[PDB]
Structure formats: structure tokens, C-alpha cells
């Protein structure tokens, strides 16, 4: 199963205020977390983000410091940047992601939507626009 793509953008309206987003993905499916490119028009300024995958603690404290797992470097205004997730229990790829059935996963961005703040590590968007993802595997 494919699973609708999560358009990681400020106006993604699925990032419910105060909660964020929840999924419940199962082993065997894929998922694209995409960063929209600014269109010739219609798109009011690109939104820069550095999306990371972290633990519950780092996700509720909206901090990417210490350790983290990079996923997206949304700093390409002309291109759609994404990450295809494969909730598999065992990666045939060294340097690939692995998910354990019945565990939780949290994706975060402590960016603030601007290039100048692309590398912040404290709140903003995560803290602010509540852009967090909680994936319940299994």
C-alpha cells in the first residue's frame, strides 16, 4: 500500500494545532514526505525546512540537538524534495532505515520557514505551527 503523501508545508492543514499528525503505518507500505517547490506563481515564497526523525523526548521538547536522523533538506525552491519511507523490519540496504513493529516514530523540523533559520535546533514550526509526525507502526 502507498499511503497518501504528507506535503510538509505550512498550509498542509493536517498538522492539527497542538497535536501535529498521526499515521499508524504498517510494515510493507511506503510513504512520501514531500517539500513543495515554489511555482512560477501561486506559490508565495518557498518554505525552507530541515526535517529530522527523532525520539519521543526530542519531539515534545522540539529539539533536534544531540542525535537525530536526517530526512529532508528542503532548500531547493525549484525542486520537489522528498523522502520515500519503507516501513520494513529489515533493510537490504546498509545506511537504510528500519522500523520495528509496535514502536513509535517522530519526524520533526525545527526550521522556521526561512533560509536564515533553516538550521535552528530549537522550536519554531515544530513548536510553532505544530509540524510533527507520529507514526504508529503495527
Amino acid at each position: 500500500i502507498v499511503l497518501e503523501p504528507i506535503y510538509w508545508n505550512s498550509s498542509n492543514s493536517k498538522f492539527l494545532p497542538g497535536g501535529g499528525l498521526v499515521l499508524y503505518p504498517q510494515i510493507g507500505d511506503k510513504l512520501d514526505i514531500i517539500c513543495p517547490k515554489v511555482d512560477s506563481k501561486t506559490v508565495g515564497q518557498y518554505e525552507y525546512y530541515k526535517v529530522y526523525m527523532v525520539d519521543k523526548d526530542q519531539a515534545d521538547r522540539c529539539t533536534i540537538k544531540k542525535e537525530n536522523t536526517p530526512l529532508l533538506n528542503c532548500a531547493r525552491p525549484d525542486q520537489d524534495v522528498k523522502f520515500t519511507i519503507k516501513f520494513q523490519e529489515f533493510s537490504p540496504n546498509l545506511w537504510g532505515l528500519e522500523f520495528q513493529k509496535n514502536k513509535d516514530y517522530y519526524i520533526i523540523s525545527t526550521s522556521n520557514g526561512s533560509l536564515e533559520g533553516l538550521d535552528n535546533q530549537e522550536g519554531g514550526v515544530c513548536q510553532t505551527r505544530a509540524m510533527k509526525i507520529l507514526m504508529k507502526v503495527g
Binding site: 511506503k30 536522523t69 536526517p70 530526512l71 529532508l72 533538506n73 531547493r76 525542486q79 520537489d80 524534495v81 522528498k82 523522502f83 520515500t84 519511507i85 519503507k86 523490519e89 529489515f90 533493510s91 537490504p92 540496504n93 546498509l94 545506511w95 537504510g96 532505515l97 528500519e98
Partner: protein, 181 residues
Amino acid sequence: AEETLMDSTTATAELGWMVHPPSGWEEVSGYDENMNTIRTYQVCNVFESSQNNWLRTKFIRRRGAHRIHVEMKFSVRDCSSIPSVPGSCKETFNLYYYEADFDLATKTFPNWMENPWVKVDTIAADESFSQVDLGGRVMKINTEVRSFGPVSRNGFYLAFQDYGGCMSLIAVRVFYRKCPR
């Protein structure tokens, strides 16, 4: 010294490569040396039998090259590290190429067999991990370069063949050496 004809590690979105048995190679995001998100394909039909999976790259223009070089970066999963341990579970794949002056390749035309497709070589894996490890164990991903014949048509396609292994095609890069050996 060399000019690249296709890099796949610059995509940031689906590559659009054709997959013969859709239940074979499947496009999935991964990383590389510098945790840079990249487009990759993989196959691991270790528990199923009679495997013949094909991954065909889009049309690559010859841009006036006579000898094409193909650099492959891939990783192989130890059959042991996998929950199920049936028979077979290979770790070698075939690299083929097909010429043509125009795209014209459809979902069925360039016949999915070494017939129309001329074989470049059979690549083995001299490294196979059992544990994912983002950032570390570089010497665990494989790098094999091959080159194929004269090539005169406007362009060509490459195609990778899996027959029951459990591997990942991390990066592919076609190119030609613009200077005599």
C-alpha cells in the same frame, strides 16, 4: 576528465525508471556518504521463487560518446540477517544496455530478456551487511564500474536484472572519458 550522462543522485523526486515485474524493483529514498537524501531502487524477493526482476533506466543520450562507463553503488543484505531463510537468495545481478535513436521504449517493447538487451557484465557483491548503519560502514556499500562497447545510436538505456537476491541500487552514474586512455 569525464563527462556524466546520467547521475540519479540529483533527482530529489521519482527517477521514473521502468520496473518490469512491478513486484520486483521498487523505488525508495535512502542516503549516501553525507546523509544526503537520494533516490534508490531495491529488491528482496528472497522468500519467493523463480525470480527475474528488471529495472530499466530512462533514455540516456550518447552526447557523442563511444565508450560508456557505468558506475554502480549498491548494498546487499545477508540472507542470514533476514527473518526468513529459504533457498537461493542470490547476490549478483546483470547489467544490460539497449541502443536506439529515439526513446520509443514502452512497457513492453524492449523485450525484457537478454535477447534484445546486450549484456555488459554480471556484477557480484564483495560486501554484504547484516545490520543497517547510516553514516558508518562505508566499506560495506559496493562500487563496481563497467564499460560497454562502441555505441553509435543517438542514445541508449541500461537495465539491471535481479534473480532472487536481496540488494539495493544506491547510486548509478553513466559517463564517458573525454581523453584517450
